[PDB]
Amino acid sequence: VNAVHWFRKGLRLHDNPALKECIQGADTIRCVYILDPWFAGSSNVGINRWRFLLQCLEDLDANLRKLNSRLFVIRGQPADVFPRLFKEWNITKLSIEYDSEPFGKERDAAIKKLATEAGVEVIVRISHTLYDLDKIIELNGGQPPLTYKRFQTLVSKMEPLEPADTITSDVIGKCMTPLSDDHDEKYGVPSLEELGFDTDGLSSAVWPGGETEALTRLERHLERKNANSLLASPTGLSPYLRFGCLSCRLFYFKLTDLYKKVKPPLSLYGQLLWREFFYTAATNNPRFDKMEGNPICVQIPWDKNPEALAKWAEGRTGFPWIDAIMTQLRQEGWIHHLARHAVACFLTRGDLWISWEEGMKVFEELLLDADWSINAGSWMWLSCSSFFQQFFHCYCPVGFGRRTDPNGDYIRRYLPVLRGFPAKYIYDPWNAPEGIQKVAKCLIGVNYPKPMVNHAEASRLNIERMKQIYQQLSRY
Template sequence: MPHRTIHLFRKGLRLHDNPALLAALQSSEVVYPVYILDRAFMTSVMHIGALRWHFLLQSLEDLRNSLCQLGSCLLVIQGEYVEVVRDHVQKWNITQVTLDAEMEPFYKEMEANIRGLGEELGFEVLSLMGHSLYNTQRILELNGGTPPLTYKRFLHILSLLGDPEVPVRNLTAEDFQRCSPPELGLAEHYGIPLPTDLKIPPESISPWRGGESEGLQRLEQHLANQAKHHSLPPVSLQGQLLWREFFYTVASATPNFTKMAGNPICLQIRWYEDAERLHKWKTAQTGFPWIDAIMTQLRQEGWIHHLARHAAACFLTRGDLWISWEEGMKVFEELLLDADYSINAGNWMWLSASAFFHQYTRIFCPVRFGRRTDPEGQYIRKYLPILKNFPSKYIYEPWTASEEEQKQAGCIIGRDYPFPMVDHKEASSHNLQLMKQVREEQYRTAQLTRDDADDPMEMKLKRDHSEENLTKTKAARMTEQT
């Protein structure tokens, strides 16, 4: 007998390459396309800020319009996730629930709860992988049951797997016509809430619009541009997708991946706890224009270039402030439109040299790195207009301009824009010594207390220690600045 199916949209707010939705349409007499807006979950677990709320609502609007064009609709139901499923399975006589398989622990728990509900109420649950290129479990199996902790090892495992599966075919109106649409009036009853309904500030809107249609257009433009530059992995789009897959794989098998404590691949570091310094970094008041412009763009637009993410993360952690990567990760999680459990935490561990990355002597200078990228400081002038009248030679270090030059620029440092909150040279040199001590201490501890060759942190420390011994000249460059 054909199913009566609820298809749950979660992360995959799209119609193209959606294997779970295609399976629902092929096996059902009626399909209810549902998005459950669990506000408590979104704020307490996902920690999304105002920009991300707007982006989500835009994405739902686009999905609704695409479904309407194919003769269906989107039902947005507000409430606690499992209770919403329980109520509507009974209300609509549902025999099947379909959804994307996800790897984040909270989504795994959510799916497990739905499966438990299915056993209780007698409906089937079908989840299919659609959010990653490969089945991460297969990668783990080929690596002996543990995640590959280096990109090189990861690529080797992929070479054994071969190419990823091709996308499933695009959905058509005929696919939806084979099923009955939801009853008339449901779409109006379960409409998409307005930002005001959710008490979201209306001015908090990014220039980046959400939705599958916008995403596909940007992808086509990016591919057209890439074809002109002939970029290769790891900097090409393909290379970046593999980095994404790498972090997804490691996160899927690492307990407490978004935390330092209890995380077996993460160095245990006694970071400083300094709420005032953290606030200055978060609110673009560090006194370093390059860093403050980055944090301003992040707050205004919800997006920054990956090199800007590197600079901001290094400054907060091992570069200047010695504040935990967890604190920076939380800020990015709130503000980034593309915030992602695996990629966000993975990159913060990487850039703080807490995991994956062993070349900790490389520190991004908050002056020279930006100047080399943008000598005229146009980026700073755009996002920090208070500094726009400074000559280019001062735009990255406005505190070095004379008082008269500051007056001519219309910005007095210390009054209109803050002095640098740290001496970068002193802070980075001190932090470099701290990082060296941390790694040496934890390596010695691992040698004394562990006899488990399979322990991921011990293997990492041994590998890094060997590489450091083989490259003493590099490690000796204590003041190296990128």
Template sequence: MKHISIHWFRKGLRLHDNPALLAAMTDCRKLYPIFILDPWFPKNMRVSVNRWRFLVESLKDLDESLQKLNSRLFVVRGRPTEIFPVLFKEWKVTRLTFEIDTEPYSRQRDSEVVRLAAEHGIQVIQKVSNTLYDTDRVIAENNGKVPLTYVRLQTLLAALGPPKRPVPAPTLENLKDCHTPCKDNHDAEYGIPTLEELGQDPEQAGPRLYPGGESEALCRLDLHMNRMAWVCNFQKPQTEPNSLNPSTTVLSPYIKFGCLSVRTFWWRLAEIYQGRKHTNPPVSLHGQLLWREFFYTAGAGIPNFNKMEGNPVCVQVDWDNNPEHLRAWSEGRTGYPFIDAIMTQLRTEGWIHHLARHAVACFLTRGDLWISWEQGQKVRHVARGSAEMVGGLQDLHG
């Protein structure tokens, strides 16, 4: 008997290289692609209107792509642990699929959802595609310990071999025996949220420099991959932090939201490198993806990685507590022109160059203000997940 499947979109907001989505479509007669607006995130992730706009645009693009497959995206409001029992019964679900997420909150949430699915007799399929490798396997290969240096991670990954190749995007053929039941009031009940619904003022959004969505991500990837000489010669320390136009790819927001598959990016680079002289990790573009992998692996295996207390690899510092200095830093009014310009750009555009990020992070912490990086990551206009944190400051880029 064919399944009634829910595919739960979270970070992987794309159709290409989405093995969990393909698993949902296999031997399936009804498919419900869903995204859950979890109230935990607006309450605990202090991010700007720019990031919310990026998410809304990504969901719209995903819904449009699903419509081309005669399907739709169902945006459901509520806590996953409360929503799923209702959906399981209402839709008579037999299978749930989703991409593995290694973030601390996500792991706790997902384990509870898996338990609920088991209580309802529902098959659960989880697939690795947010990272290049299965982080648990990498840690297991290191005798159950998190690799604490980039070089050690490289050694482990060399033994594991290259990342898996991306899987193809689904086509109408994948859904020939499957359909998505939609009501006439679909948009009213399951439509894409507005910024107002998310508690955001659209007037406060900065210029729309980086539209969200898989379509935009793939176009930008093609644009950069056509610059073969630039790709082969890329060295991250030699990019320009103060150029008016970004001197890096600005693909990381698309990777963070899963609009672009990191494995797709990796293998496109590998094709360009083949037979050509090119830079190598850690400074190459492959090297930048490995830095991402390094921090995701660390975040997956180190307790309290996004905090100082209870974090076994974090230096315990007696930070100053100065709310006025923190506000001045976050609002770009420290009196240091370079720092203030960077923070203004971050607030308005949602993106800053990696060297600029390091500069303001160092200014906040050990450089001048001696304020905890935990306070820095709470600043409202930052926009990236804790596992991708470098230097204590987060932004829409990387």
């Protein structure tokens, strides 16, 4: 009985039902991760996401060493590699954490067919989400809830959540891992260079990957529970929830019991419920990330403007607040939710009137904490393309951050070319007189671009555009 556990999400040894069940009754246990380096550059996956993943894999491998096992990293496509491994290792069991996202579901269905057609038993267990999303969808009558309010109703009628024991020496028991001395050069965790990324200009990651870092942060986050809010927090947990280094169910229980000790609203579960809601909404919708052909998405005639899109993506808008946020995102992989509101409003309903699909693709590349379902759901939501509950405040790309940080310390940290400007002009340097730009050694339009748009005029038009869209929807 040779059992293999396939890692994709759920990159942890705690609360891993699929791994626990696969281990039980197995003589052999082997943990695999599959990636192809040749397609790493063309997959819209940025270097920070790759680095966080590789660090997750190093931590899994290290933690597996403590249990006397090892992680197997295989280069290739899962449809091509799994037949060879079934025969090479005489696989009897294959286990995966369930993936609700449509393209992952189709991929897993193909792998399940090949495993079964080869006489391999397929173990699937839910642990990336709090609930069985198909059970939520059934309780809603076969269609996913279209509103956060309806979703909360169904969750409130759900039975209280049960977690799962951590994989230990006592859990593994008499289960072995076949290991060779050539293992590291054959199945070792890849470097970024192997994936084709230049690392010479890199600095240490602000968000270190892995289950160890996630559980260390969780204890400090529970202990603890402006301009400094914008900076990454050493107790932030959102990337670890996305990659599965931290179980959302464990996080839920720890939050509940700390709250019980401190004092049971959904104020503290709000982020997890939004996460759960977008997974539920996307799971049966293969065009969830599209406007055309997406049955839940308002059809809005967005501008097609690649040059403006590229200015926003590359932090070259000429609005330092917007550019500092997009620069933090590209450099670190995480920005504050209020900063996401700011740059996403600017791109779509606010200033540039560019499709939410284009912002989603940029965020997909650079953002560490948003799966496909959450990214698409969040972009449709903020652009009033789906899940509509109200019109939104139009954020000011100059004033909003100025009230956040009057001195512009956030601007100065991520846009060093502007550090010479005084606070009076740091958020609108195109208003600085010529002599002031010279002193700051930053000529607007040479060292830093001019503003790409007039916010007052653009936002005024776009606020009205959105109203007309929704007046049409009332008539239909």
